[PDB]
Amino acid sequence: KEMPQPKTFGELKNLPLLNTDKPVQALMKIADELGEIFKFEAPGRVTRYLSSQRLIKEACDESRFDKNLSQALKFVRDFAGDGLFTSWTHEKNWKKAHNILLPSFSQQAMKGYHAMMVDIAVQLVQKWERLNADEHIEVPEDMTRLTLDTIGLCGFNYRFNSFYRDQPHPFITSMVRALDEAMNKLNKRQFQEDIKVMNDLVDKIIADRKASGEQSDDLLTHMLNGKDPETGEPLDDENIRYQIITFLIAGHEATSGLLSFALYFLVKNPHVLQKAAEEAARVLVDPVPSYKQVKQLKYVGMVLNEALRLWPTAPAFSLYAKEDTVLGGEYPLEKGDELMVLIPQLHRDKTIWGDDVEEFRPERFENPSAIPQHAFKPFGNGQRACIGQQFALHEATLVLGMMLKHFDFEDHTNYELDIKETLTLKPEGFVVKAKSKKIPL
Numbered sequence: 001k002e003m004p005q006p007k008t009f010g011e012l013k014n015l016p017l018l019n020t021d022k023p024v025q026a027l028m029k030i031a032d033e034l035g036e037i038f039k040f041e042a043p044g045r046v047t048r049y050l051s052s053q054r055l056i057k058e059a060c061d062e063s064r065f066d067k068n069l070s071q072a073l074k075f076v077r078d079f080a081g082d083g084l085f086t087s088w089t090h091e092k093n094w095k096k097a098h099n100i101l102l103p104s105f106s107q108q109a110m111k112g113y114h115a116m117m118v119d120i121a122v123q124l125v126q127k128w129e130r131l132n133a134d135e136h137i138e139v140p141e142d143m144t145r146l147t148l149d150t151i152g153l154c155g156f157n158y159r160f161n162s163f164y165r166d167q168p169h170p171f172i173t174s175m176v177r178a179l180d181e182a183m184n185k186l187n188k189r190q191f192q193e194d195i196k197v198m199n200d201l202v203d204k205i206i207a208d209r210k211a212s213g214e215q216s217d218d219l220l221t222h223m224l225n226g227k228d229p230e231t232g233e234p235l236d237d238e239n240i241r242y243q244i245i246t247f248l249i250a251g252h253e254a255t256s257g258l259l260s261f262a263l264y265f266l267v268k269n270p271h272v273l274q275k276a277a278e279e280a281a282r283v284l285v286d287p288v289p290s291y292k293q294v295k296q297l298k299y300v301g302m303v304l305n306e307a308l309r310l311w312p313t314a315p316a317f318s319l320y321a322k323e324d325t326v327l328g329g330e331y332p333l334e335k336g337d338e339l340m341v342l343i344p345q346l347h348r349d350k351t352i353w354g355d356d357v358e359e360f361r362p363e364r365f366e367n368p369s370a371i372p373q374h375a376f377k378p379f380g381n382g383q384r385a386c387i388g389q390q391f392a393l394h395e396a397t398l399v400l401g402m403m404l405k406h407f408d409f410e411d412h413t414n415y416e417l418d419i420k421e422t423l424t425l426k427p428e429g430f431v432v433k434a435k436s437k438k439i440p441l
């Protein structure tokens with residue numbers, strides 16, 4: 001009835017406990033010790049971290065709780081503005097952009113993005129085909145080049161050409177710098193300059209596109225042509241800019257993390273790699289994968305969901321109570337009280353997944369309808385769930401399928417998993433060697 005709480009440090013309350021490079025991983029250990037709910041205080045602030053499916057299912061009831069803008073999201077809003085990710089559900093622009101963009105992110109819409117995804121995926125595979133025998137792959141680095149360039153191409157038909165450079169395109173440098181600064185706040189001169197670099201490029205492309213009248217298969221065309229069904233209003237140019245920034249900010253790192261963790265688990269589990277590779281060989285019979293082929297990569301899809309189970313790459317989200325309510329029959333909350341969903345702990349709930357939760361077993365996802373509601377939430381919840389979920393999974397399934405078709409992989413360093421935390425998670429320093437199977441591409 002009384003909620004556990006970890007060590008306090010006087011006026012600093014619990015804050016010193018997150019004085020670490022790996023706060024989510026620290027929080028998982030606190031959850032291991034304290035159980036399914038604990039209080040966590042800082043000077044300004046109180047939240048309650050939830051870890052069990054029993055309480056998280058209640059937290060996911062949208063009549064009772066809505067998305068909160070956590071401090072991290074408030075700092076990100078300095079450059080992501082009122083784009084979808086950093087808006088309250090009640091802001092007019094959240095609803096407008098959500099209504100306009102939702103069908104442009106459906107599974108069906110992936111058919112329209114597929115050619116541009118393949119363009120970047122082929123660039124990645126060709127890079128690896130072109131390595132000499134003495135060389136190796138920097139996995140999260142190459143995965144981030146791929147996802148950034150894919151979201152730039154599908155997002156606004158802009159080529160960052162990340163596979164042509166050691167130093168990233170200057171927009172990328174400013175975006176990555178801007179993100180780091182917002183996370184570190186949890187400089188100012190550089191922050192403003194980096195914001196300006198982002199707005200300038202994105203505003204220019206928007207202005208260029210409106211001028212030429214060109215129609216493309218990208219999200220920018222959808223946003224220039226879209227009208228909110230409720231009001232009949234379009235998004236204005238400022239908000240369109242924030243959405244483009246948001247697709248890059250929200251999408252690039254979580255998706256490259258997922259591809260990196262999935263390859264990690266595959267090289268650490270050779271039997272699973274071989275089963276995934278046999279499927280990729282059977283299904284991807286053409287030098288350029290089709291949309292329909294990617295959809296037949298069922299076990300690759302299971303591999304990706306099981307990677308998201310263990311290390312969901314956007315690991316926590318924040319909610320507030322809409323009205324006074326009692327959580328789990330035991331914990332009274334007041335209107336506005338905050339909850340944090342700790343997704344890696346949720347995904348380790350032994351009452352749902354059985355005792356073997358640390359084991360990498362894609363077969364858990366063989367029958368998606370036996371996973372209970374709200375047991376598996378790597379893309380968040382309800383109407384504030386990831387709008388990019390189909391995009392991320394189509395991209396990851398395509399790319400992983402191709403990697404497994406085209407190369408054998410060696411964990412040549414016997415890499416020890418080290419999870420770096422930013423807004424997202426990734427296996428820092430993960431490296432492999434890939435030997436080409438010499439299959440046409």
Ligand code: HEM
Binds near residue numbers: 086250318379
């Ligand atoms: C595997 C990769 C990804 C993961 C694990 C992921 C995860 C998430 C999660 C957990 C949220 C909810 C945030 C919260 O409740 O505060 C979210 C929201 C969002 N994501 Fe993703 N994401 C991924 C990829 C992407 C991609 C590629 C894009 C864009 C193309 C994207 C765009 C967005 C947007 C715009 C939102 C806000 C949606 C709204 O609230 O209306 N994400 N994502």
